[PDB]
Design a protein around this nucleic acid. Structure first.
Length: 88
RNA sequence: ACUGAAACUGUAGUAGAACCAAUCGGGGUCGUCAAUA
């Protein structure tokens, strides 16, 4: 069989459009949405940090509400039972 | 003379080891102060 495409299209989840507008040109604020989380690996016998295993990771603050547009291009003939299966 | 489809930038990883909030100090003891007549 030929490969089926998806019935669901799912956009990228972006920050609220008005919040995004508030940020424009405020480079310092865009950086402040995220922060360094430290990361280190400990040696199991010495209980001390391994060599090499020290990392700093950008993480984005919790509380972000993002929304993505979704499209369900369901077939024209699909039954109401099968619609409710997809929704389920 | 016809939009390729489908695919999580994810997986493993202790911001930790070492470091004395500490060193010295009798709750003690005597003559000063003012300037003239």
């Amino acid at each position: 069989p030929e490969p089926r495409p998806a019935l669901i299209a799912i956009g990228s989840a972006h920050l609220d459009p008005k919040l995004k507008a508030a940020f424009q040109g405020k480079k310092q604020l865009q950086e402040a949405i995220a922060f360094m989380k430290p990361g280190v690996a400990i040696d199991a016998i010495t209980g001390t940090a391994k060599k090499d295993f020290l990392r700093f990771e950008e993480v984005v603050r919790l509380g972000a509400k993002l929304t993505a547009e979704v499209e369900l291009n369901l077939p024209d003939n699909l039954s109401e039972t099968n619609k409710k299966v997809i929704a389920g």
